[PDB]
Design a protein around this motif. Structure first.
Motif, PDB file in Angstrom:
ATOM      1  N   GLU A 159       0.789  -1.017   0.091  1.00  0.00           N
ATOM      2  CA  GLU A 159      -0.022  -0.079   0.036  1.00  0.00           C
ATOM      3  C   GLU A 159       0.874   1.317  -0.133  1.00  0.00           C
ATOM      4  O   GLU A 159       0.479   2.101  -0.549  1.00  0.00           O
ATOM      5  CB  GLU A 159      -0.898  -0.076   1.230  1.00  0.00           C
ATOM      6  N   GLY A 196      -1.118   3.443  -2.392  1.00  0.00           N
ATOM      7  CA  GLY A 196      -2.422   3.179  -1.666  1.00  0.00           C
ATOM      8  C   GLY A 196      -3.199   4.260  -1.585  1.00  0.00           C
ATOM      9  O   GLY A 196      -4.565   4.363  -1.374  1.00  0.00           O
ATOM     10  N   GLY A 197      -2.952   5.634  -1.373  1.00  0.00           N
ATOM     11  CA  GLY A 197      -3.506   6.725  -1.342  1.00  0.00           C
ATOM     12  C   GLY A 197      -4.312   7.006  -2.479  1.00  0.00           C
ATOM     13  O   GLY A 197      -5.511   7.608  -2.694  1.00  0.00           O
ATOM     14  N   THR A 218      -5.129   4.527  -4.721  1.00  0.00           N
ATOM     15  CA  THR A 218      -5.866   3.466  -5.071  1.00  0.00           C
ATOM     16  C   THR A 218      -7.167   3.645  -4.073  1.00  0.00           C
ATOM     17  O   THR A 218      -8.406   3.431  -4.311  1.00  0.00           O
ATOM     18  CB  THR A 218      -5.538   2.261  -4.985  1.00  0.00           C
ATOM     19  N   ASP A 219      -7.011   4.020  -2.786  1.00  0.00           N
ATOM     20  CA  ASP A 219      -8.297   4.393  -1.943  1.00  0.00           C
ATOM     21  C   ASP A 219      -8.755   5.408  -2.544  1.00  0.00           C
ATOM     22  O   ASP A 219     -10.426   5.395  -2.187  1.00  0.00           O
ATOM     23  CB  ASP A 219      -7.414   4.733  -0.552  1.00  0.00           C
ATOM     24  N   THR A 235     -11.178   3.964  -5.340  1.00  0.00           N
ATOM     25  CA  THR A 235     -12.033   3.048  -4.834  1.00  0.00           C
ATOM     26  C   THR A 235     -13.280   3.685  -4.075  1.00  0.00           C
ATOM     27  O   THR A 235     -14.275   3.650  -4.225  1.00  0.00           O
ATOM     28  CB  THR A 235     -11.571   1.960  -3.823  1.00  0.00           C
ATOM     29  N   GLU A 236     -12.802   4.672  -3.449  1.00  0.00           N
ATOM     30  CA  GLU A 236     -13.881   5.595  -2.629  1.00  0.00           C
ATOM     31  C   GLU A 236     -14.878   6.296  -3.952  1.00  0.00           C
ATOM     32  O   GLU A 236     -15.940   6.194  -3.748  1.00  0.00           O
ATOM     33  CB  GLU A 236     -13.539   6.727  -1.931  1.00  0.00           C
ATOM     34  N   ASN A 261     -17.111   3.853  -5.222  1.00  0.00           N
ATOM     35  CA  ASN A 261     -18.276   3.527  -4.405  1.00  0.00           C
ATOM     36  C   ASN A 261     -19.322   4.570  -4.700  1.00  0.00           C
ATOM     37  O   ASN A 261     -20.615   4.090  -4.550  1.00  0.00           O
ATOM     38  CB  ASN A 261     -17.926   3.418  -2.930  1.00  0.00           C
ATOM     39  N   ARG A 273     -12.746   0.964 -10.404  1.00  0.00           N
ATOM     40  CA  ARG A 273     -12.145  -0.108  -9.888  1.00  0.00           C
ATOM     41  C   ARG A 273     -11.119  -0.692 -10.735  1.00  0.00           C
ATOM     42  O   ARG A 273      -9.923  -1.116 -10.459  1.00  0.00           O
ATOM     43  CB  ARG A 273     -13.135  -1.093  -9.646  1.00  0.00           C
ATOM     44  N   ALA A 328      -7.968   1.405 -10.334  1.00  0.00           N
ATOM     45  CA  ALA A 328      -7.546   0.989  -8.883  1.00  0.00           C
ATOM     46  C   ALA A 328      -6.690  -0.267  -9.005  1.00  0.00           C
ATOM     47  O   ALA A 328      -5.594  -0.289  -8.450  1.00  0.00           O
ATOM     48  CB  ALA A 328      -8.780   1.200  -7.820  1.00  0.00           C
ATOM     49  N   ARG A 332     -17.702  13.506   0.861  1.00  0.00           N
ATOM     50  CA  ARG A 332     -17.463  12.804   2.030  1.00  0.00           C
ATOM     51  C   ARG A 332     -18.289  13.463   3.214  1.00  0.00           C
ATOM     52  O   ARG A 332     -18.723  12.792   4.139  1.00  0.00           O
ATOM     53  CB  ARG A 332     -15.968  12.806   2.238  1.00  0.00           C
TER      54      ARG A 332
END
Length: 327
Positions: A3, A7-8, A10-11, A14-15, A18, A34, A37, A83
């Motif tokens: 990660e 990871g920053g 890909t997170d 992914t968010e 969603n 996706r 990501a 968010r």
DNA sequence: CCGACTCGCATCAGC
DNA sequence: GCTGATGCGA
DNA sequence: GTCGG
């Protein structure tokens, strides 16, 4: 890679995936994010620019722009905004309940039902599936260690054989590929008496027996060929009780069983590769059958398949055990 | 420029 | 009541 | 959102 690398990014993606799926109801954008990501997650370098990322298949102009913004500022304005949006974040959250999809979550939030506590208070507005998803909300988000999957498989195979020793059952999914943990249990079932040209009790009697020994605890849906429910390992009578787990059981005609086992073992990537390769050899493979393609592309009748290896042999591939079906 | 990116079951909408 | 659409999950 | 015919 780890990660630490991307990871920053890909997170972030992914968010965004969603929210596309659960709030905007834009399933193809969900899958685009996706896809982005996943290709980035496999990239073995820490990305320095959107331009670098755009070279990867599935990363386009807009995600490259978002990556530039994230690398420069450490955040993305649009995601920071959504968010803290009470409505969008609540809709997104509610879809974590199994049975609450984007349409139900939107409807709930529209009428002021935004939290698990709100759902707990409005059970009459929940269907059977959603009530089960709410009841096991936390359990369903836990992974299943491989050791528990083996104990789970022990029970399934024993009880299946007890009902009729001529059943064939196979636990598929990533578990069958040797994964150290699983998200659920996917059981493929057949019986020599059930062919594509053939009892509407073959599935029911297995489900009933697993209910009788108190392994299956709840049912989400059940028809003549697919069961989707809940199970729980027995606890040491003393020890803490195990989480409730999702289990699916599919009844498949015998002449389509090994195509089914191949498909539901995966990987997704391996499935796509094998299907690509099958085409190039003149065959079409889906979850049910392998059929030859004529010179004008017309599919012939399904070919006999009596093992996974039969499918490999048709397309002239070396048989690979599930552990080597990563891709 | 513009369309692509599967199916069983539960339940709803319409008749 | 039945038929087909939709939502859902995987 | 990305790809590609």
């Amino acid at each position: 890679p780890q990660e630490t690398l991307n990871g920053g990014i890909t997170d972030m993606l992914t968010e965004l995936a969603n929210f596309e799926k659960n709030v905007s109801q834009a399933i193809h954008k969900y899958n685009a994010y996706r896809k982005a990501a996943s290709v980035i997650a496999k990239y073995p370098h820490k990305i320095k620019s959107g331009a670098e990322a755009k070279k990867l298949p599935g990363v386009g102009t807009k995600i490259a722009e978002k990556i530039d913004e994230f690398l420069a500022t450490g955040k993305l304005r649009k995601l920071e905004k959504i968010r803290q949006d009470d409505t969008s974040s609540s809709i997104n959250f509610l879809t974590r309940v199994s049975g609450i999809g984007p349409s139900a979550a939107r409807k709930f939030v529209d009428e002021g039902i935004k939290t698990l506590e709100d759902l707990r208070k409005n059970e009459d507005k929940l269907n059977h599936h959603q009530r089960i998803g709410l009841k096991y909300f936390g359990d369903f988000e836990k992974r299943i260690p491989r050791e528990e999957m083996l104990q789970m498989q022990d029970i399934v195979l024993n009880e299946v054989k007890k009902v009729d020793s001529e059943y064939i059952a196979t636990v598929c999914g990533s578990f069958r590929r040797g994964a150290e943990s699983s998200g659920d249990m996917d059981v493929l079932l057949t019986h020599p008496s059930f062919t594509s040209e053939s009892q509407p009790k073959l599935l029911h009697q297995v489900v009933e027996q697993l209910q009788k020994v108190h392994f299956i605890t709840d049912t989400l849906s059940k028809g003549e060929t697919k069961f989707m429910g809940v199970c729980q390992l027995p606890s040491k009578n003393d020890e803490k009780e195990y989480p409730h787990r999702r289990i699916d059981i599919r009844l498949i005609p015998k002449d389509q069983y090994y195509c089914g086992v191949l498909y539901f073992t995966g990987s997704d990537i391996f499935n796509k590769n094998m299907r690509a390769h099958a085409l190039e050899k003149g065959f079409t493979i889906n979850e049910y059958t392998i059929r030859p393609l004529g010179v004008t592309g017309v599919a012939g009748e399904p070919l006999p398949v009596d093992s996974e290896k039969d499918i490999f042999d048709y397309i002239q591939w070396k048989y690979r055990e599930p552990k080597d079906r990563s891709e």
